[PDB]
Symmetry: D3
Amino acid sequence: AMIVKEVYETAEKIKSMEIRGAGRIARAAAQALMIQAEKSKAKEPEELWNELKVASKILYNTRPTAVSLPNALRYVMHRVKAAYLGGADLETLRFTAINSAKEFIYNSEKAIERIGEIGAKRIEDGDIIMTHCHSKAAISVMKKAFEQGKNIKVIVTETRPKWQGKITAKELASYGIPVIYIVDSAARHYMKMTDKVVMGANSITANGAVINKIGTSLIALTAKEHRVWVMIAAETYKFHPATMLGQLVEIEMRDPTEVIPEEELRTWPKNIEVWNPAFDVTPPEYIDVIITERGIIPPYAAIDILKEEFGWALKYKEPWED
Amino acid sequence: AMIVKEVYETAEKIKSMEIRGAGRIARAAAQALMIQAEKSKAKEPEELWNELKVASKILYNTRPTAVSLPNALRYVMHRVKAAYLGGADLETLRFTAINSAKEFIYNSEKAIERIGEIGAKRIEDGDIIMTHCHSKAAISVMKKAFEQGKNIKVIVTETRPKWQGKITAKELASYGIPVIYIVDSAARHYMKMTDKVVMGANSITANGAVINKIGTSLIALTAKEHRVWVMIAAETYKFHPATMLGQLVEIEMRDPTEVIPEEELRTWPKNIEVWNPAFDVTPPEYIDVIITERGIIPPYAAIDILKEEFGWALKYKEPWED
Amino acid sequence: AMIVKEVYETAEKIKSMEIRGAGRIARAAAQALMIQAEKSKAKEPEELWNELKVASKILYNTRPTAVSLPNALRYVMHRVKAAYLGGADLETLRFTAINSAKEFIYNSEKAIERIGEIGAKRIEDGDIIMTHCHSKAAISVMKKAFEQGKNIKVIVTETRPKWQGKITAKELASYGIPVIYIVDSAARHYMKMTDKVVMGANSITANGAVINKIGTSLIALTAKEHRVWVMIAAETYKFHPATMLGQLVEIEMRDPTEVIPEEELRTWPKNIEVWNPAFDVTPPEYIDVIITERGIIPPYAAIDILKEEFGWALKYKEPWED
Amino acid sequence: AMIVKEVYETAEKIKSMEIRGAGRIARAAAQALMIQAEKSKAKEPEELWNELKVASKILYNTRPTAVSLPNALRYVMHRVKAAYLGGADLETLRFTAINSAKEFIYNSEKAIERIGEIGAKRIEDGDIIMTHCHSKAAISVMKKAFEQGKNIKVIVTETRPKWQGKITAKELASYGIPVIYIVDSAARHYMKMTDKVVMGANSITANGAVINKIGTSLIALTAKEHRVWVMIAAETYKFHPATMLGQLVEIEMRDPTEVIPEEELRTWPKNIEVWNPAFDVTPPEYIDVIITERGIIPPYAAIDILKEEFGWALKYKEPWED
Amino acid sequence: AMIVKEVYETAEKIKSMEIRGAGRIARAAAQALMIQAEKSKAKEPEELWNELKVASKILYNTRPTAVSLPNALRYVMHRVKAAYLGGADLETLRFTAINSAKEFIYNSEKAIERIGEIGAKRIEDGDIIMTHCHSKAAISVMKKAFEQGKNIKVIVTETRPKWQGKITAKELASYGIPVIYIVDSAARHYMKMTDKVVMGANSITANGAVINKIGTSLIALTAKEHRVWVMIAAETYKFHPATMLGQLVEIEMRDPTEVIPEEELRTWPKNIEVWNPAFDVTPPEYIDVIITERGIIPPYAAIDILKEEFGWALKYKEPWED
Amino acid sequence: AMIVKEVYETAEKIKSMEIRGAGRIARAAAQALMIQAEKSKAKEPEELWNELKVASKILYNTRPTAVSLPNALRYVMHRVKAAYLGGADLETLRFTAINSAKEFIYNSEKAIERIGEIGAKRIEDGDIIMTHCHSKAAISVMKKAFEQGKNIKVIVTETRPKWQGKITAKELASYGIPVIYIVDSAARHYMKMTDKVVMGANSITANGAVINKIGTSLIALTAKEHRVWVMIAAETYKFHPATMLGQLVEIEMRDPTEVIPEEELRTWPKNIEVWNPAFDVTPPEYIDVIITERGIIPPYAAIDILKEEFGWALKYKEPWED
Ligand SMILES: Nc1ncnc2c1ncn2[C@@H]1O[C@H](COP(=O)(O)O)[C@@H](O)[C@H]1O
Ligand SMILES: O=P(O)(O)OC[C@H]1O[C@H](OP(=O)(O)O)[C@H](O)[C@@H]1O
Ligand SMILES: O=P(O)(O)OC[C@H]1O[C@H](OP(=O)(O)O)[C@H](O)[C@@H]1O
Ligand SMILES: O=P(O)(O)OC[C@H]1O[C@H](OP(=O)(O)O)[C@H](O)[C@@H]1O
Ligand SMILES: O=P(O)(O)OC[C@H]1O[C@H](OP(=O)(O)O)[C@H](O)[C@@H]1O
Ligand SMILES: O=P(O)(O)OC[C@H]1O[C@H](OP(=O)(O)O)[C@H](O)[C@@H]1O
Ligand SMILES: [K+]
Ligand SMILES: [K+]
Ligand SMILES: [K+]
């Protein structure tokens, strides 16, 4: 019940997308549980255990679609839970939580560097790469390919409604990479000059489907139409455990004013509904490879990544639940 | 040549897209020649003929892609040239121009009505319709189907960068028609609930391809993927004669500042290029029917429309050439 | 208002499908018009005119999907009407109706044997041909090719619910053509051994789509999948003039007792709805050729059959109307 | 050689399809093995062993296509065999056979209700689901989802020739699920209004293909065409171990009298062959997921189900062999 | 019966492909009938008529697949036949034949220049064009595009068995055009760098299929897979009249030694058959446009080219027949 | 290092393709290391280790694409390196090399046999099989299916530029198997009569793509178009480990003079470039099954083969690196 302010501020900052990107919100959430355990004034283990459960619930209940976030929380709290239930005293608990969270953060950072190097071998000198939204994993691949001296150009899609495309373009251009910026609508038109597509992921399902930023399934579709390789750069913690047992992933519907600003929308008629899905779902048939920190897989090998990292936990409850 | 200010002003408003839409700019160019003819101070028929040629060229060099405009100019000018060359006197030439421009304007208005009556028959009670940009021809269909008492909803795509979807959404709402407004990236995600696609055209080619607002081809692609009928509402003067003899249609590239506003765009590094094609091309295999004022055709019958109405002219030079 | 029993008997027999097959029902309506004229006790030209308009409406309100039937009634009534409006006396009108029926009925027979001759040229020695329902035009093709000494075998799908495939199997076998009889569900399984598919049509639209017995579109889809030629054998009076101006064809829904017999259906619970559609719609992209009495066309040239033989009549009302 | 009548009665009832459905026949063969052990008048361990090998062969030679049946006989006989070869006395062997049957039979029941639970998670409120034949695993899915309070409707294809769709329709309606009953030919026509397809399996191969009731592959093809999820609900004992080493599955050809009744068939000429295939084969590319009792897989992970649970046994001979 | 040697020598030279290419053999055949009429020693018209029939039969019976050849013969002999049957005297016949043949030859030459100019507008600066075999029509397009200053490169396929690819490569390279020469097998591999495909035709059917050099259908297929425009450059006399009435085009099977030289094949075992089809058939769905001397058409407009140039003659016998 | 002439001679014969075929060159490289080890005059184990490393590199730098060769070298050298580093004396090192090379050679021969026994089960009585190049693995399948008494015919493609089809045709004929020999361009034209496609592989990637003789991808493309099973017969040592970590396979570009002989080629102008890729890449969606010595897999299960047998090594440098 004695939740420190950094937990609430991180939760809010995930909700408002001031902190965004599936990897980042997962690291931020691990960091929040880390600080809760740093600054906790609890005396008993039972007390700190209970603070960490509640912090974890607050953080889970921010944004639903990227399983990166629950997987972060799980990574920390499977360990914290095993400690507490094994009889660890206060400081043995405090450290288990803090250290588990530090592990996840470090492993996330290393995973992304690694995805960069693996994916870059798939990029060739002269390539024109089209990307969508702003994905650290995808940018790692493109950045690495450029540092290897491959002379590349990236077609960056603006990525409505929230313009993540702007971030992507200034970022790649600041590393020296030539950028071509277009609207989402122009993806087919420019698919004819594109050699490779590199996008990220928020959740990957057991059958190989990729839930990523709205628009992704379209770029994928047309890439298939033209035989351009769709490469999804994604850490293993993007893979979605509960899809193993039949769960559909929730698609986050965000506020209509991200599309039509409040000052404008209030003046619009009542029979207009504005629908603002945050993600769509791309089928495995439109994906060439998924580049994980453990290597290149075909998208249908997602079930293998999950069988072996994740499946064990599905017979238990979540490690923050009563 | 002494060109009236209405010609210059029309030309600027077409360039700037204050006046926009394929059919409307064609009416605005007819109108402009009408007014050059009305307000002319010419004494000799050669002097007026010269004014009409120069005005025609000013209007021609506004926007390239939509062939409606050239076709409107031709409709007036073939007739003006036949009179002048057949020895018409000043007033008979003036009236030929005025009256030809009027006929085109009236024919365009009636054709749009007829297109609506025709396309509406293919809309069924309960249909969810997806559209793109703001096409008067497409809208005529939706408007008439609603007026027949069919309960429809229209999914309207915002149509970046110039946001024509806003015009379409407000217009359909004003007639009583519920709208679902979405970003362009969401067209595949909502194709699964869509019963019909209805878009316009700027130019249609001899092989049946449809040049229309940027992103049209994406929507038609995923429509096909999903077996949703793609219906293109379009006047005969949208069909492109020069394509009969192999001409490719120029795709208008518009200012970067429509995509990114000038204030923001001047802050960006020089190795980001903003590219803003205003149209793409949708191949005939992704189009179910074209709905013209003379009936439903498959897209490959575009050559028939071109043969029977515009082929005759391709042996002659352009009717405004001096 | 004095309508002869034969008109009523034909109508009732078209409704119960005792008279069936798109061509046959058309000939039966023409026959009925002919007999209404032959047996008329009408003493005035206006009195006969009124009997024929009324017989036409009775006949038109039997089965809606096959345009063959109304195109037959048209052929006659356009001619009856031009006579009546030109001032024709009684026996001139009676004869115009008698000799218009005769003409259509004889032209139907000639068209069907000519489709035989043309279609048989696309059947090759050794061919295995799959068909569906019982189409006289399809059968003419197959029977002619067997008479050219080509060793063929026909796969006859049983064609639920009304078992028309039994008629086809006994018919083709009676000519000495070996038949393979299968359930409809088995059409994909046998498509691998099939060389050609030959089916009939109830109506063909302006854009090339073919409305024919329920199932036809599935057989056509898997035929496309396997690159087996789908050939549609159809008289020019199967082409649907109203589709030129956007009309959709109504799909006859027939009695659920044709699917589940009345004795058994009455015992079933109300929360099972039985839906019996008599036709489906096959898109033009899955049709290699339509074989008409005037030649082979790609399905997209359906609009030409229509433009050249039927379009004239769409500016007038139906010839049996007040 | 002293085989108890129940074994003979089960075999005859699997042959006539009085006992049918891949799971049920498997449980029935296990039940029969169990009763052969219970009622055996055998005084030696070698005498019982020999009765069970012989009962197994009788049961295996009933219907070939569904691997479920031999995987059941295996489950038991592998265990009977290891006992017998380990030196087991009589009542130890009798019990090993009794308790292996029991185990398989109970595990079949648990597997089928677990597929219910997992599969139901992919059904969404409002869904219209098409199915085919009568599959207990498919039905468990649909029934569980209805018990979660999701308003669904099921389209039941009648499933010629043996009319299994009648069993499915009455079953689902008995649980209060509204049903739409249609002929098989109508599956493309209704695919446009279908949200999900759920079908069972008789055998699933190493590369993902699904052998199931004749028709299944057509429904799957048009489902793919329309981007409707095709979900296969199947116990792990439907997976076919011999396909790992290249074996193809035999397609049972059943009596032509199931298609044309004997009373009518005898009147037909000899040059009509009636071919009644009980199953077809659906390729993996047209299957979105297999739902097993252990999870959701892409169809290409069938080889893992097999590698991990069955492959061990392929270096030995069949457990009922000499 | 008094056939001059140039007729026999041309026939033989067509048979051996010393004269080849569909246009060329058509011109050569017209030329042969021209010389027969130059050097004829006939006295009566009836005598010369009879020489021209027999010359025509000799020339027709050379190579079967390119309808260019019969259409040449027809063009000359429809005119010669009308003259003779109208009562023309010897010299009026002699000139009719000679002049008709001179017309065809000139019109063929002009048609090809014209196809060149039309097709070249479809070629863009920088384009890499893949072609197949050696087609004058296709080369006209590429040559013209290069003379317009478009900087192009052509991928020339070797075109087994007869190596026409060598001719094509030396020809284009002698005009200054950069050539990349590859084997037929590499067409897919290099389809990714190709912007346009330009091939010729031997016969074009009523439904839009293109019979062209063996291999054409493959290049077309993969071009569709990659969305590369397939442009077929072809004169109207390549279009095939009798396909209007159901005729399949014969595919010429040429001597096995063109594949395996005689010195080698004689040593090969008896159970090896060498099959050497000269042409395959490409479906209309894989063709973007057909470029005729009358302009760009979609391939399904082939029936229109035939309806209007050719259909009239199909109610008559050939103009060389008794 | 004193390298025996057998190493140098093997290396030259691999380069020149005197010894060719993916599997054979791998055996020839094992063999060559065997012989370096047998005939070595080394006194110290370090001196032999050095010889084995240098020989390994000479053999590695022969031909790049087929990963069988590197894998054979690795099989021997991992084991040689473990011995040398574990302190083996001269003779124990010599024998480790000799014996490792022998095991690889024996395993390769047995694997090819097993592949035949496995693939043959998927060949049915009456099958027409199309193959490409000369693959011992594919041939083992065809040979065994014939020996099982299945009546097969094989369509053999000539496989330019090096004409490996000649080897395949003579070899299959010599076993009794009828052959149809065709040029590569005719593969689509004969796909319509083909029941099965059976080819080999040089390298198979982590995502399931198959690098095989130039034109393989074309044949698989049209096979897919036609629903003909594409089966790839291939040993586990054809699977490519470095692709697990993103490596793309180099495609061997061979001398222009294989395509055009040197005598002819020196006469050609310098602006013709002959390009001779020896392989292409066939994507996994066009492959039905890969038949390895351990069973049938779908192509996407290539990652499983790579994980379970070769992944372990990718953390270590190459076992011949100094
Ligand atoms: N050089 C290469 N090395 C490894 N994999 C490749 C290479 N080139 C293409 N691929 C893969 O093989 C397939 C070829 O696809 P496409 O580029 O459509 O021909 C894709 O699945 C790629 O991931
Ligand atoms: O983890 P990284 O690769 O950085 O981004 C992965 C994905 O998460 C983001 O979602 P949002 O912007 O938070 O909704 C984008 O959809 C992006 O592709
Ligand atoms: O003639 P209507 O149907 O109104 O418009 C047709 C098309 O012209 C417009 O172009 P723009 O907005 O002027 O660039 C849009 O592309 C629209 O679909
Ligand atoms: O195991 P469950 O899911 O009940 O049924 C599986 C399958 O078995 C049935 O076969 P048949 O009626 O025995 O020929 C049907 O093909 C059904 O899909
Ligand atoms: O008329 P042009 O365009 O020159 O050639 C047309 C076609 O005829 C040739 O046949 P062949 O070499 O005579 O069998 C080639 O197939 C070529 O594409
Ligand atoms: O191992 P096996 O099955 O014999 O051969 C496999 C493949 O290797 C060969 O390459 P090349 O002829 O050496 O360039 C061919 O591509 C062939 O299909
Ligand atoms: K591209
Ligand atoms: K390309
Ligand atoms: K085939």
